[PDB]
């Protein structure tokens, strides 16, 4: 139902072509953060998204990601945030699905890592093999 909702949302994206709307996506990272009792539920949505979605969205699929998680650590605390945890299980497999993005979209990624970066999202043995994984390309 909560999740129901935010699939509806996610899945959205696809009747829009990228760059994402800043409304929608604050929609889509609403029904996460009011869903956040069933955040696997949510984390594991996203991933899907990404692994299936079309190559124009996975910098939009990278986006909702960015998003739920700042949002999250501004609204709970750093240290409360139940999203990037959970994110980060898995997250080896989301880049490589991510990185199979159109050339023009791979530096939005590297953007988004160097920001995590130095915010501190992640810890350096998250974000550096994701800066390799780029360079490797
Ligand atoms: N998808
Ligand atoms: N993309
Ligand atoms: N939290
Ligand atoms: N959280
Ligand atoms: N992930
Ligand atoms: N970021």
Redesign the pocket.
């Known amino acids: 139902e909560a999740v129901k909702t935010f699939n509806s949302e996610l899945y959205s994206l696809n009747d829009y072509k990228p760059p994402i709307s800043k409304a929608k996506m604050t929609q889509i990272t609403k029904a996460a953060i009011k869903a956040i009792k069933f955040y696997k539920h949510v984390v594991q949505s996203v991933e899907k998204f990404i692994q299936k979605c079309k190559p124009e969205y996975k910098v939009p699929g990278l986006y909702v990601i ?1 998003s739920i998680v700042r949002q999250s650590r501004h609204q709970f605390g750093q240290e409360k945030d139940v999203f990037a945890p959970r994110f980060s299980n898995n997250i080896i497999s989301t880049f490589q699905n991510l990185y199979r993005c159109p050339g023009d979209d791979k530096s939005k990624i590297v953007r ?1 890592l160097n ?2 970066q130095k915010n501190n999202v992640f810890k350096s043995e998250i974000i550096q093999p994701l800066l390799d994984m780029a360079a490797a390309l």
């Open positions: 960015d988004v920001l995590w």
